[PDB]
Amino acid sequence: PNFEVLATFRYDPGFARQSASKKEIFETPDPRLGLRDEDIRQQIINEDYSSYLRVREVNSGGDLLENIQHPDAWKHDCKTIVCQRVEDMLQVIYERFFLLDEQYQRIRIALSYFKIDFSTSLNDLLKLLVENLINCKEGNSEYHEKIQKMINERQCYKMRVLVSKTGDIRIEAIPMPMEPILKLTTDYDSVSTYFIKTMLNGFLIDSTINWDVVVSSEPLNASAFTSFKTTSRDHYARARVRMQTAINNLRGSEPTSSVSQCEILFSNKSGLLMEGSITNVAVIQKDPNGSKKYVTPRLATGCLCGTMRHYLLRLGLIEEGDIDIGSLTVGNEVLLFNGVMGCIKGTVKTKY
Numbered sequence: 065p066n067f068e069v070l071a072t073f074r075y076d077p078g079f080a081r082q083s084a085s086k087k088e089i090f091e092t093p094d095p096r097l098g099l100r101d102e103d104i105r106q107q108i109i110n111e112d113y114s115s116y117l118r119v120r121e122v123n124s125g126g127d128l129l130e131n132i133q134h135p136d137a138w139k140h141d142c143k144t145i146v147c148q149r150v151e152d153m154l155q156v157i158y159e160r161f162f163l164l165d166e167q168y169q170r171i172r173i174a175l176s177y178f179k180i181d182f183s184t185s186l187n188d189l190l191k192l193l194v195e196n197l198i199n200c201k202e203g204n205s206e207y208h209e210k211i212q213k214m215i216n217e218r219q220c221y222k223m224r225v226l227v228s229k230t231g232d233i234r235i236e237a238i239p240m241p242m243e244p245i246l247k248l249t250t251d252y253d254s255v256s257t258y259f260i261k262t263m264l265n266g267f268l269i270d271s272t273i274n275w276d277v278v279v280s281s282e283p284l285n286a287s288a289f290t291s292f293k294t295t296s297r298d299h300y301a302r303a304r305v306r307m308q309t310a311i312n313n314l315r316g317s318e319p320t321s322s323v324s325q326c327e328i329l330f331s332n333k334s335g336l337l338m339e340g341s342i343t344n345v346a347v348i349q350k351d352p353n354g355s356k357k358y359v360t361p362r363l364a365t366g367c368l369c370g371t372m373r374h375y376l377l378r379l380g381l382i383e384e385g386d387i388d389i390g391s392l393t394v395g396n397e398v399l400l401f402n403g404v405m406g407c408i409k410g411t412v413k414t415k416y
Protein backbone atom coordinates (compact mmCIF):
# COMPACT_ATOMS: atom_id res chain seq x y z
CA PRO A 65 0.00 0.00 0.00
CA ASN A 66 0.93 3.71 -0.32
CA PHE A 67 0.67 4.61 3.37
CA GLU A 68 1.58 7.77 5.29
CA VAL A 69 3.05 7.95 8.75
CA LEU A 70 0.48 9.59 10.99
CA ALA A 71 0.49 11.81 14.10
CA THR A 72 -2.69 13.24 15.72
CA PHE A 73 -2.71 15.49 18.80
CA ARG A 74 -4.72 18.21 20.53
CA TYR A 75 -4.20 21.96 20.01
CA ASP A 76 -5.86 23.60 23.04
CA PRO A 77 -5.63 27.36 23.71
CA GLY A 78 -6.69 26.68 27.33
CA PHE A 79 -3.31 24.98 27.93
CA ALA A 80 -1.39 28.28 27.65
CA ARG A 81 -3.56 31.23 28.55
CA GLN A 82 -3.08 34.97 28.88
CA SER A 83 -3.27 36.01 32.54
CA ALA A 84 -6.48 37.94 33.37
CA SER A 85 -4.57 40.07 35.93
CA LYS A 86 -1.25 40.81 34.15
CA LYS A 87 -1.05 40.97 30.36
CA GLU A 88 2.70 40.19 30.05
CA ILE A 89 2.05 36.79 31.68
CA PHE A 90 0.88 33.51 30.12
CA GLU A 91 -0.19 30.67 32.43
CA THR A 92 0.48 26.99 31.78
CA PRO A 93 -0.17 23.87 33.91
CA ASP A 94 1.76 23.11 37.14
CA PRO A 95 5.14 21.40 36.28
CA ARG A 96 3.97 18.28 38.19
CA LEU A 97 1.60 17.67 35.30
CA GLY A 98 4.67 16.94 33.13
CA LEU A 99 3.80 18.87 29.97
CA ARG A 100 7.35 20.37 29.69
CA ASP A 101 9.62 17.37 30.44
CA GLU A 102 13.30 18.46 30.51
CA ASP A 103 14.75 15.02 29.77
CA ILE A 104 12.65 14.69 26.61
CA ARG A 105 13.52 18.28 25.60
CA GLN A 106 17.23 17.39 25.90
CA GLN A 107 16.75 14.09 24.03
CA ILE A 108 15.36 16.04 21.08
CA ILE A 109 18.20 18.63 21.27
CA ASN A 110 20.56 15.62 21.17
CA GLU A 111 18.68 14.00 18.23
CA ASP A 112 17.90 11.04 20.47
CA TYR A 113 14.51 9.73 19.29
CA SER A 114 14.79 6.05 20.22
CA SER A 115 14.79 6.88 23.98
CA TYR A 116 11.02 7.35 23.50
CA LEU A 117 10.82 3.52 23.55
CA ARG A 118 12.70 3.07 26.81
CA VAL A 119 10.73 2.05 29.90
CA ARG A 120 11.31 4.75 32.55
CA GLU A 121 12.39 2.52 35.44
CA VAL A 122 9.91 2.75 38.37
CA ASN A 123 8.04 5.86 39.53
CA SER A 124 7.40 7.93 42.63
CA GLY A 125 4.19 9.14 40.94
CA GLY A 126 1.39 7.95 43.27
CA ASP A 127 0.23 10.92 45.34
CA LEU A 128 0.04 12.70 42.03
CA LEU A 129 -3.11 10.58 41.53
CA GLU A 130 -4.53 11.69 44.90
CA ASN A 131 -3.86 15.36 43.98
CA ILE A 132 -5.30 15.02 40.44
CA GLN A 133 -8.46 13.66 42.09
CA HIS A 134 -8.80 17.13 43.69
CA PRO A 135 -8.62 19.06 40.44
CA ASP A 136 -9.96 22.38 41.81
CA ALA A 137 -7.22 22.54 44.45
CA TRP A 138 -4.53 23.27 41.82
CA LYS A 139 -3.58 26.93 42.06
CA HIS A 140 0.11 26.86 41.05
CA ASP A 141 0.12 27.51 37.34
CA CYS A 142 3.47 28.03 35.66
CA LYS A 143 3.91 31.71 34.70
CA THR A 144 5.98 32.98 31.73
CA ILE A 145 6.70 36.54 30.55
CA VAL A 146 5.55 36.78 26.93
CA CYS A 147 6.28 39.81 24.71
CA GLN A 148 4.71 40.70 21.36
CA ARG A 149 7.63 39.06 19.52
CA VAL A 150 7.19 36.22 17.02
CA GLU A 151 9.46 33.88 19.08
CA ASP A 152 7.44 34.35 22.26
CA MET A 153 4.22 33.83 20.34
CA LEU A 154 5.48 30.66 18.59
CA GLN A 155 6.43 29.34 22.04
CA VAL A 156 2.88 29.94 23.38
CA ILE A 157 1.48 28.04 20.36
CA TYR A 158 4.02 25.23 20.83
CA GLU A 159 2.86 24.87 24.48
CA ARG A 160 -0.72 24.48 23.26
CA PHE A 161 0.15 21.36 21.21
CA PHE A 162 -0.32 18.34 23.47
CA LEU A 163 2.88 16.20 23.76
CA LEU A 164 4.37 17.52 20.50
CA ASP A 165 7.90 16.56 21.66
CA GLU A 166 6.80 12.94 22.23
CA GLN A 167 4.89 12.96 18.92
CA TYR A 168 8.07 14.20 17.27
CA GLN A 169 10.22 11.40 18.69
CA ARG A 170 7.74 8.74 17.65
CA ILE A 171 7.39 10.07 14.11
CA ARG A 172 11.22 10.11 13.75
CA ILE A 173 11.39 6.47 14.92
CA ALA A 174 8.61 5.37 12.56
CA LEU A 175 10.17 7.27 9.63
CA SER A 176 13.57 5.71 10.32
CA TYR A 177 11.98 2.23 10.56
CA PHE A 178 10.08 2.65 7.27
CA LYS A 179 13.24 4.12 5.60
CA ILE A 180 11.58 7.41 4.68
CA ASP A 181 14.02 10.32 4.28
CA PHE A 182 13.26 13.16 6.67
CA SER A 183 15.07 16.28 7.73
CA THR A 184 12.42 18.53 9.22
CA SER A 185 13.45 19.67 12.71
CA LEU A 186 10.91 19.98 15.54
CA ASN A 187 11.14 23.77 15.25
CA ASP A 188 10.48 23.54 11.49
CA LEU A 189 7.50 21.25 12.13
CA LEU A 190 6.14 23.74 14.67
CA LYS A 191 6.36 26.51 12.04
CA LEU A 192 4.49 24.28 9.58
CA LEU A 193 1.76 23.69 12.18
CA VAL A 194 1.52 27.44 12.74
CA GLU A 195 1.29 28.14 8.98
CA ASN A 196 -1.58 25.68 8.79
CA LEU A 197 -3.44 27.28 11.73
CA ILE A 198 -3.08 30.86 10.40
CA ASN A 199 -3.32 29.96 6.70
CA CYS A 200 -0.27 32.14 6.02
CA LYS A 201 3.41 31.56 5.32
CA GLU A 202 6.43 32.94 7.16
CA GLY A 203 7.72 35.92 5.17
CA ASN A 204 4.23 37.17 4.23
CA SER A 205 3.63 40.74 5.40
CA GLU A 206 0.59 39.63 7.44
CA TYR A 207 2.27 36.67 9.18
CA HIS A 208 2.94 38.52 12.47
CA GLU A 209 -0.54 40.03 12.73
CA LYS A 210 -2.19 36.69 11.86
CA ILE A 211 -0.19 34.92 14.57
CA GLN A 212 -1.42 37.46 17.16
CA LYS A 213 -5.02 37.08 15.92
CA MET A 214 -4.97 33.25 15.93
CA ILE A 215 -3.44 33.14 19.42
CA ASN A 216 -6.36 35.14 20.88
CA GLU A 217 -8.81 32.58 19.48
CA ARG A 218 -10.27 29.85 21.70
CA GLN A 219 -11.00 27.11 19.17
CA CYS A 220 -9.53 23.66 19.94
CA TYR A 221 -8.29 21.49 17.04
CA LYS A 222 -7.34 17.91 16.40
CA MET A 223 -4.08 18.30 14.47
CA ARG A 224 -3.15 15.63 11.92
CA VAL A 225 0.37 15.40 10.52
CA LEU A 226 0.84 12.98 7.61
CA VAL A 227 4.27 12.14 6.14
CA SER A 228 4.32 10.35 2.75
CA LYS A 229 6.87 7.73 1.61
CA THR A 230 8.81 10.53 -0.11
CA GLY A 231 8.89 12.48 3.16
CA ASP A 232 6.35 15.15 2.15
CA ILE A 233 4.42 16.61 5.08
CA ARG A 234 0.71 17.43 4.98
CA ILE A 235 -1.14 19.01 7.91
CA GLU A 236 -4.83 19.22 8.82
CA ALA A 237 -6.52 21.01 11.71
CA ILE A 238 -9.96 19.60 12.53
CA PRO A 239 -12.08 21.83 14.80
CA MET A 240 -13.15 20.11 17.98
CA PRO A 241 -15.85 21.17 20.48
CA MET A 242 -15.39 21.61 24.23
CA GLU A 243 -17.71 20.22 26.91
CA PRO A 244 -20.21 23.09 27.48
CA ILE A 245 -19.60 23.58 31.21
CA LEU A 246 -15.80 23.65 30.74
CA LYS A 247 -16.23 26.09 27.84
CA LEU A 248 -18.31 28.45 29.96
CA THR A 249 -16.19 28.39 33.10
CA THR A 250 -12.60 27.82 31.86
CA ASP A 251 -11.58 31.39 32.86
CA TYR A 252 -12.59 30.81 36.49
CA ASP A 253 -10.26 27.97 37.34
CA SER A 254 -6.49 27.60 36.90
CA VAL A 255 -4.91 26.29 33.71
CA SER A 256 -3.82 23.23 35.78
CA THR A 257 -7.42 22.55 36.71
CA TYR A 258 -8.60 23.02 33.09
CA PHE A 259 -5.91 20.62 31.93
CA ILE A 260 -6.83 17.92 34.50
CA LYS A 261 -10.57 18.15 33.71
CA THR A 262 -9.94 18.01 29.94
CA MET A 263 -7.18 15.39 29.66
CA LEU A 264 -7.15 13.38 32.93
CA ASN A 265 -10.91 13.00 33.27
CA GLY A 266 -10.62 9.19 33.47
CA PHE A 267 -8.93 9.51 36.88
CA LEU A 268 -11.58 11.76 38.47
CA ILE A 269 -13.86 10.27 41.09
CA ASP A 270 -16.98 12.07 39.75
CA SER A 271 -16.39 11.90 36.00
CA THR A 272 -19.47 11.39 33.81
CA ILE A 273 -17.77 10.23 30.55
CA ASN A 274 -17.77 6.45 30.39
CA TRP A 275 -17.48 4.66 27.06
CA ASP A 276 -19.14 1.34 26.45
CA VAL A 277 -16.41 -1.19 25.65
CA VAL A 278 -16.57 -4.32 23.46
CA VAL A 279 -14.07 -7.12 24.08
CA SER A 280 -13.27 -8.65 20.66
CA SER A 281 -13.09 -12.41 20.08
CA GLU A 282 -10.80 -11.81 17.08
CA PRO A 283 -7.08 -11.44 17.63
CA LEU A 284 -5.04 -9.02 15.52
CA ASN A 285 -1.59 -9.78 14.17
CA ALA A 286 1.06 -7.52 15.65
CA SER A 287 2.88 -5.72 12.83
CA ALA A 288 4.71 -2.51 11.98
CA PHE A 289 1.18 -1.14 11.34
CA THR A 290 0.16 -1.79 14.91
CA SER A 291 3.42 -0.73 16.65
CA PHE A 292 3.45 2.52 14.64
CA LYS A 293 0.72 4.96 13.72
CA THR A 294 -0.06 5.19 10.01
CA THR A 295 -2.92 5.47 7.54
CA SER A 296 -2.73 1.72 6.88
CA ARG A 297 -5.53 0.80 9.22
CA ASP A 298 -7.70 -1.89 7.60
CA HIS A 299 -7.26 -4.08 10.72
CA TYR A 300 -8.56 -1.36 13.05
CA ALA A 301 -11.34 -0.47 10.60
CA ARG A 302 -12.48 -4.14 10.64
CA ALA A 303 -12.45 -4.07 14.45
CA ARG A 304 -14.56 -0.89 14.44
CA VAL A 305 -17.18 -2.46 12.15
CA ARG A 306 -17.38 -5.39 14.57
CA MET A 307 -17.62 -2.88 17.47
CA GLN A 308 -20.58 -1.28 15.66
CA THR A 309 -22.37 -4.66 15.37
CA ALA A 310 -21.77 -5.46 19.07
CA ILE A 311 -22.75 -2.01 20.40
CA ASN A 312 -25.93 -1.96 18.29
CA ASN A 313 -26.83 -5.45 19.53
CA LEU A 314 -26.20 -4.24 23.13
CA ARG A 315 -28.19 -0.99 22.73
CA GLY A 316 -31.00 -2.70 20.77
CA SER A 317 -30.60 -0.59 17.62
CA GLU A 318 -30.18 -1.75 13.98
CA PRO A 319 -26.69 -3.25 13.36
CA THR A 320 -25.98 -0.68 10.63
CA SER A 321 -26.61 2.44 12.82
CA SER A 322 -23.75 4.77 13.71
CA VAL A 323 -22.30 4.32 17.22
CA SER A 324 -20.36 6.69 19.49
CA GLN A 325 -18.97 6.74 23.05
CA CYS A 326 -17.67 3.22 22.55
CA GLU A 327 -14.42 1.38 21.91
CA ILE A 328 -13.36 -2.15 21.08
CA LEU A 329 -10.36 -3.87 22.77
CA PHE A 330 -8.50 -6.76 21.10
CA SER A 331 -5.62 -9.13 21.83
CA ASN A 332 -2.68 -10.26 19.71
CA LYS A 333 -2.33 -13.84 18.51
CA SER A 334 -0.96 -14.97 21.89
CA GLY A 335 -4.15 -13.79 23.66
CA LEU A 336 -2.58 -10.77 25.38
CA LEU A 337 -4.64 -7.58 25.39
CA MET A 338 -3.12 -4.98 23.08
CA GLU A 339 -5.14 -1.78 22.83
CA GLY A 340 -8.37 -0.27 21.46
CA SER A 341 -9.05 0.79 17.86
CA ILE A 342 -8.19 4.46 18.61
CA THR A 343 -6.79 4.33 22.17
CA ASN A 344 -4.29 2.61 24.43
CA VAL A 345 -5.87 0.85 27.46
CA ALA A 346 -5.20 0.30 31.13
CA VAL A 347 -7.15 -2.29 33.12
CA ILE A 348 -8.04 -1.66 36.79
CA GLN A 349 -6.55 -4.26 39.13
CA LYS A 350 -6.38 -4.41 42.92
CA ASP A 351 -3.94 -5.61 45.55
CA PRO A 352 -4.47 -5.69 49.31
CA ASN A 353 -5.59 -3.45 50.73
CA GLY A 354 -7.96 -2.95 47.79
CA SER A 355 -5.91 -0.09 46.31
CA LYS A 356 -6.40 0.29 42.54
CA LYS A 357 -3.55 -0.03 40.07
CA TYR A 358 -3.90 0.81 36.39
CA VAL A 359 -2.13 -1.75 34.26
CA THR A 360 -1.32 -1.17 30.59
CA PRO A 361 -0.07 -3.68 28.01
CA ARG A 362 3.67 -3.75 27.14
CA LEU A 363 4.89 -2.74 23.66
CA ALA A 364 5.98 -6.37 23.21
CA THR A 365 2.24 -7.06 22.53
CA GLY A 366 2.42 -5.09 19.29
CA CYS A 367 0.21 -2.23 20.54
CA LEU A 368 0.85 1.34 19.39
CA CYS A 369 3.50 3.22 21.41
CA GLY A 370 0.87 5.90 22.21
CA THR A 371 2.04 9.32 23.34
CA MET A 372 -0.69 9.53 25.99
CA ARG A 373 0.35 6.06 27.18
CA HIS A 374 3.98 7.29 27.36
CA TYR A 375 2.94 10.40 29.26
CA LEU A 376 0.89 8.46 31.82
CA LEU A 377 3.77 5.98 32.26
CA ARG A 378 6.39 8.66 32.90
CA LEU A 379 4.06 10.35 35.41
CA GLY A 380 3.64 7.00 37.23
CA LEU A 381 -0.18 7.07 36.79
CA ILE A 382 -0.24 3.71 34.96
CA GLU A 383 2.20 0.83 34.98
CA GLU A 384 3.04 -1.85 32.45
CA GLY A 385 1.81 -5.46 32.85
CA ASP A 386 0.65 -8.53 30.91
CA ILE A 387 -3.13 -8.88 30.65
CA ASP A 388 -4.79 -11.95 29.13
CA ILE A 389 -7.77 -10.85 27.03
CA GLY A 390 -9.74 -13.70 28.68
CA SER A 391 -9.53 -11.91 32.04
CA LEU A 392 -11.81 -9.05 30.96
CA THR A 393 -15.45 -9.53 31.88
CA VAL A 394 -18.66 -7.51 31.61
CA GLY A 395 -18.62 -4.82 34.31
CA ASN A 396 -14.82 -4.38 34.41
CA GLU A 397 -13.62 -0.78 34.50
CA VAL A 398 -10.87 0.35 32.12
CA LEU A 399 -9.05 3.56 31.20
CA LEU A 400 -8.80 4.54 27.52
CA PHE A 401 -6.39 7.15 26.25
CA ASN A 402 -5.02 9.01 23.23
CA GLY A 403 -3.25 12.33 22.56
CA VAL A 404 -6.42 14.10 21.41
CA MET A 405 -8.91 13.45 24.22
CA GLY A 406 -6.48 12.32 26.93
CA CYS A 407 -7.70 9.68 29.37
CA ILE A 408 -11.33 8.61 29.96
CA LYS A 409 -13.19 5.80 31.70
CA GLY A 410 -14.69 2.84 29.89
CA THR A 411 -16.69 -0.13 31.08
CA VAL A 412 -16.72 -3.56 29.42
CA LYS A 413 -20.34 -3.98 28.31
CA THR A 414 -20.30 -6.87 25.82
CA LYS A 415 -18.14 -9.43 24.05
CA TYR A 416 -18.12 -10.16 20.34
Ligand SMILES: *Cc1c(COP(=O)(O)O)cnc(C)c1O
Nearest residue numbers: 341343344368370371372402403
Ligand atom coordinates in the same frame (compact mmCIF):
# COMPACT_ATOMS: atom_id res chain seq x y z
C1 LIG B 1 -3.99 6.93 18.13
C2 LIG B 1 -3.96 5.53 18.61
C3 LIG B 1 -3.57 5.23 20.00
C4 LIG B 1 -3.19 6.35 20.94
O1 LIG B 1 -1.95 6.99 20.54
P1 LIG B 1 -1.67 8.47 21.05
O2 LIG B 1 -0.27 8.77 20.55
O3 LIG B 1 -1.84 8.49 22.56
O4 LIG B 1 -2.68 9.37 20.37
C5 LIG B 1 -3.54 3.90 20.40
N1 LIG B 1 -3.86 2.88 19.56
C6 LIG B 1 -4.26 3.06 18.28
C7 LIG B 1 -4.59 1.89 17.42
C8 LIG B 1 -4.33 4.42 17.72
O5 LIG B 1 -4.70 4.64 16.44
